[PDB]
Design a protein around this ligand. Structure first.
Ligand SMILES: CC(C)n1nc(C(F)F)cc1C(=O)Nc1ccc([C@H]2[C@@H](O)CCCc3cncn32)c(-c2ccccc2)c1
Ligand SMILES: [Zn+2]
Lengths: 260, 292, 174
C-alpha cells in the first residue's frame, strides 16, 4: 500500500542528501504514478525541483505548501523561507514579479533574514555589498550556480538590478561614481551599461568623452503639468481630511456660508 | 422617471417593425438620441485606434421619428462580410443573456482628421445596409478634431435611396475637408442627410458624474493641449499652404473663391492655437505667479 | 501594494449595468462583472469592463466559467493589449459572499482586484472602492481578507472631453 511509496521517498531523500539528484528525480517521477492512489511527496518534489536549477517552480510549490494547516508552524515558516530564497535568485520574468508581489503581500515574510532583499528587489532599490554577502552566506551550495569562467549569476543579476534602480535616482552619472556605486571597475560599469542599453533594457545614452551616462530627460512643460496635478491633489486631500476629521465646525458651516 | 427610456418592451418594437412607416416616406428619421455610455465608448475606441480608422456596431431601438442608441461594440477589422458578421452574431448571442435585449440599429466608424461625412464607399455601404436591414444610421466620429476643438465631433447620417432626387434644402455647415478628399466630398454630398444628434443619461449616471467632478477638475486644470496635438497642426498648415497655392493659381488666371475657404481654414487653425496658448497663460497666472 | 488608476468609463459601465438590470427586473439587483486593463510594473490601470453571467444555487453565487472564457476570447479578438484584471459588483461594505466570489475568481487570475460601487449613497464622495485580497493565518486556519487601495483617475484628453460633454449637456472665446 504505502510501504513501497515510503521506501521510494526514503531512497530519493537519501540520494538527494548524497548529491545524486538524477536517480532521485527518476524515482520521484516513477512514484508520482502511484502517488495519486492515496504531504511528504510534495516536499520531495519541491526539493527535487530546487536541486534542478528550476527555482520559480520550486518557489511556487513551497509557497502553495506553506498554507497547509496540517503542518506545524515552524515547518510552514521553513517552506516560506525556501520559497523566498528560490524567488530571489530565480530567473527574471513576469512570473518572478508576480511571485515577488505575492511574497511582499505576505505578513509572515517579515520575520525572515532575507525579507530586506525581497523588499529591495520588489521596490526597485539598491542592494549594497553587505546584504548580498549575508544572502550568499545563508545560501546552500547547490544554489550558487557559477559559470566555469566565473561571472556568478546572482552577482550579475544584482548588478543589473542595482543599475536599473540607479536609473531612477540619477538624471545622469559619471563612470567613476557608477563604478563606485555598483562596486565594480569603471570600465566594467561602462560595458554593462552599454550592453543593457543595446538590448533595450534601459533608456539612455553614453557620452564617452565626458564619461557620462544619461538616463531619461524629464522635460520641462510635462514636469510643470505633473507638479500642478500633484499640488491640486494635495489641496483635495487636505480638504478631504479637514472635512472627515472635523465635521460641523469649520467644514460644513463655512461650506454653507460660502454657498450663501 | 428619466430612467423610463431604459425600459425595453419587445411587443411595441415588433409592432413598429411590422407596421414600418419609413417605407413610405424618405425623410422620416430626423432625430438621433445617443446614450452617454455609448458616446463615451465610441470616443474611447476611436482614440485608442490612433491615426487609423476603427469601426463598430450600434445597438438600440426606435421611437416614433427617433433613433435611440444604447450601447456599442468594436468589430475586429484586424471586413464587410464573413468575419464582421460572425463577430456581430456571436456578440449579440453572448450579450442577449446578460441583460442587453436590444438589436443593431447602426454602424459607426472614425474619420480621423478629415471631418464627419460619408464617402462614396460609406454611401454604398449605407445603401446596402438600408436595403436589407432597416432602420439604420451611420455615425461618423472625428477623434482628432475632438481634442483640437474641445468639442465632440460626431455626425449621424442616413442615405437617400437610389433614383431619388430631393429638392435642395441643404444647410451644409462648412467643413474643412483636406485637399485630397474634396473631390470625394463633392460627388457624394446630396445622397445622404444628417440627423440632429442629442444625448441622454440616466439618474445614477448623473449622480455619479456630479460626484466625479469633485475630483476630476484637476485634469482640466493641468491639460496643456498645446503639446498633445502638434502633428495635427503641422498637417493642417501643410494642407492650408496647398490650398493657398491653388487659390493663388486661380487668382493668376481670369470651388468658387478658393481664397475665402483657405482663409477660413487658416482662421480655424490659428484660433485653435491661440486657445491652446491662453489656457497655458491662465495656468501660469494661477500657479507660477504666487512668487513668495 | 499596487497603485491603481481608474477610468470613468468603467464607472459608467457599472452604473449602466445596474440601471438596466433594475429597470428590467423591476427591483434593484446586485450585478457582477469583470474588468480589463493594463499593468506596468506595479501600477495597474483599469480601462474597460464587460458584464459576466452568474447563477445562484442555494444561497451562493457561482460564476459561469465557460461564458467567461468565451467573452475573454471575444474581447481578445479586438483589444489585444488589454488583459483581465479583476471583477466588480454593486453593494456596500464587503461581505462573505464577496469573499466566496473572490475565491472563485482567484482560480482565473492569481491576484485580482475587487471593485465595489454603492448606487444608494448619501455622502458627497465617489462610492467606488478598490480592494485586494490578502491571505492570513488566524487560529491556525487560512482565511483571506480585503485590504483597500487608494485609486486615482486616469488622464486622457478624449475621455476628459467626452465626460465634460456628458456632465454639462448644454462666440468661441466665450
Ligand atoms: C457595417 C460594415 C461592417 N459594413 N457592412 C457592409 C455591407 F456590405 F453589409 C459593408 C460594411 C463596411 O465594411 N463598410 C466600410 C467601407 C469602407 C471602410 C474604410 C475603407 O474605405 C478603407 C479605409 C478608409 C475609409 C474611410 N471611410 C471608410 N473607410 C470601412 C472601414 C472603416 C473603419 C475601419 C475599417 C474599415 C468600412
Ligand atoms: Zn468612411
Amino acid at each position: 500500500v504505502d510501504y513501497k511509496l515510503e521506501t521510494y521517498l526514503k531512497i530519493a531523500r537519501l540520494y538527494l542528501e548524497d548529491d545524486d539528484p538524477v536517480q532521485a528525480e527518476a524515482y520521484i517521477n516513477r512514484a508520482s504514478l502511484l502517488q495519486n492512489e492515496s504531504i511528504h511527496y510534495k516536499v520531495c518534489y519541491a526539493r527535487v525541483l530546487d536541486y534542478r536549477r528550476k527555482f520559480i517552480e520550486a518557489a511556487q510549490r513551497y509557497n502553495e505548501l506553506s498554507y497547509k494547516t496540517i503542518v506545524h508552524e515552524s515547518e510552514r515558516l521553513e517552506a516560506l523561507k525556501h520559497a523566498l530564497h528560490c524567488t530571489i535568485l530565480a530567473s527574471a520574468g513576469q512570473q518572478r514579479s508576480r511571485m515577488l508581489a505575492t511574497l511582499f503581500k505576505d505578513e509572515r515574510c517579515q520575520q525572515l533574514a532575507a525579507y530586506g532583499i525581497l523588499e529591495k528587489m520588489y521596490l526597485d532599490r539598491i542592494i549594497r555589498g553587505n546584504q548580498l554577502q549575508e544572502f550568499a552566506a545563508m545560501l546552500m551550495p547547490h544554489q550558487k550556480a557559477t559559470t566555469a569562467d566565473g561571472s556568478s549569476i546572482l552577482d550579475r543579476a544584482v548588478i543589473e538590478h542595482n543599475l536599473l534602480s540607479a536609473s531612477k535616482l540619477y538624471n545622469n552619472i559619471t563612470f567613476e561614481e557608477l563604478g563606485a556605486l555598483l562596486e565594480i571597475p569603471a570600465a566594467k560599469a561602462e560595458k554593462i551599461a552599454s550592453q543593457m542599453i543595446t538590448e533595450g533594457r534601459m533608456n539612455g545614452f553614453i557620452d564617452q568623452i565626458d564619461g557620462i551616462v544619461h538616463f531619461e530627460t524629464r522635460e520641462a512643460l510635462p514636469t510643470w503639468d505633473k507638479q500642478i496635478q500633484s499640488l491640486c491633489f494635495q489641496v483635495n486631500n487636505l480638504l478631504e481630511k479637514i472635512s472627515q476629521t472635523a465635521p460641523e465646525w469649520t467644514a460644513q458651516a463655512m461650506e454653507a456660508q460660502m454657498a450663501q | 422617471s428619466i430612467d423610463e427610456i431604459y425600459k425595453y418592451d419587445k411587443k411595441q418594437q415588433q409592432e413598429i417593425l411590422a407596421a414600418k412607416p419609413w417605407t413610405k416616406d424618405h425623410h422620416y428619421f430626423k432625430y438621433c438620441k445617443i446614450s452617454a455610455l455609448a458616446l463615451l465608448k465610441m470616443v474611447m475606441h476611436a482614440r485608442s485606434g490612433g491615426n487609423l480608422e476603427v469601426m463598430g456596431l450600434m445597438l438600440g431601438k426606435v421611437d416614433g421619428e427617433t433613433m435611440i442608441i444604447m450601447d456599442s461594440f468594436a468589430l475586429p477589422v484586424e471586413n464587410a462580410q464573413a468575419a464582421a458578421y460572425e463577430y456581430m452574431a456571436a456578440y449579440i448571442e453572448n450579450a442577449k443573456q446578460v441583460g442587453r435585449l436590444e438589436n443593431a440599429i447602426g454602424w459607426y466608424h472614425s474619420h480621423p482628421g478629415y471631418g464627419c461625412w460619408l464617402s462614396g464607399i460609406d454611401v454604398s455601404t449605407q445603401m446596402l445596409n438600408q436595403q436589407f436591414q432597416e432602420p439604420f444610421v451611420a455615425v461618423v466620429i472625428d477623434p482628432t478634431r475632438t481634442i483640437s476643438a474641445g468639442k465632440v465631433n460626431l455626425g449621424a447620417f442616413r442615405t437617400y435611396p437610389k433614383g431619388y432626387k430631393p429638392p435642395d434644402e441643404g444647410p451644409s455647415e462648412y467643413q474643412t475637408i483636406p485637399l485630397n478628399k474634396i473631390e470625394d466630398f463633392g460627388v457624394h454630398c446630396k445622397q445622404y442627410y444628417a440627423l440632429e444628434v442629442s444625448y441622454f443619461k440616466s439618474s445614477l449616471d448623473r449622480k455619479l458624474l456630479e460626484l466625479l467632478w469633485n475630483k476630476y477638475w484637476v485634469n482640466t486644470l493641468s491639460s496643456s493641449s498645446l503639446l498633445t496635438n502638434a502633428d495635427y497642426t503641422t498637417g493642417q498648415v501643410f494642407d492650408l499652404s496647398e490650398k493657398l497655392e491653388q487659390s493663388e493659381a486661380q487668382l493668376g488666371r481670369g470651388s468658387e473663391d478658393k481664397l475665402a475657404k483657405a482663409t477660413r481654414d487658416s482662421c480655424k487653425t490659428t484660433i485653435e492655437a491661440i486657445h491652446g496658448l491662453m489656457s497655458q497663460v491662465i495656468k501660469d497666472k494661477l500657479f507660477n505667479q504666487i512668487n513668495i | 501594494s499596487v497603485s491603481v488608476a481608474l477610468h470613468p468609463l468603467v464607472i459608467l459601465n457599472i452604473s449602466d449595468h445596474w440601471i438596466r438590470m433594475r429597470s428590467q427586473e423591476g427591483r434593484p439587483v446586485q450585478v457582477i462583472g469583470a474588468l480589463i486593463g493594463k499593468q506596468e510594473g506595479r501600477n495597474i490601470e483599469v480601462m474597460n469592463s464587460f458584464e459576466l453571467l452568474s447563477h445562484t444555487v442555494e444561497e451562493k453565487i457561482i460564476i459561469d466559467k465557460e461564458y467567461y472564457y468565451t467573452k475573454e476570447e471575444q474581447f481578445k479578438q479586438v483589444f489585444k493589449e488589454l488583459e483581465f484584471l479583476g471583477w466588480y459588483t454593486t453593494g456596500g461594505p464587503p461581505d462573505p459572499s464577496d469573499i466566496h466570489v473572490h475565491k472563485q475568481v482567484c482560480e482565473i487570475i492569481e491576484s485580482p482586484l475587487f471593485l465595489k460601487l454603492n448606487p444608494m449613497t448619501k455622502h458627497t464622495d465617489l462610492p467606488v472602492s478598490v480592494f485586494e485580497s490578502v491571505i492570513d493565518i488566524i487560529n491556525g486556519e487560512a482565511t483571506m481578507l480585503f485590504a483597500e487601495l487608494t485609486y486615482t483617475l486616469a488622464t486622457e484628453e478624449a475621455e476628459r472631453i467626452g465626460v465634460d460633454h456628458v456632465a454639462r449637456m448644454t462666440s468661441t472665446v466665450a
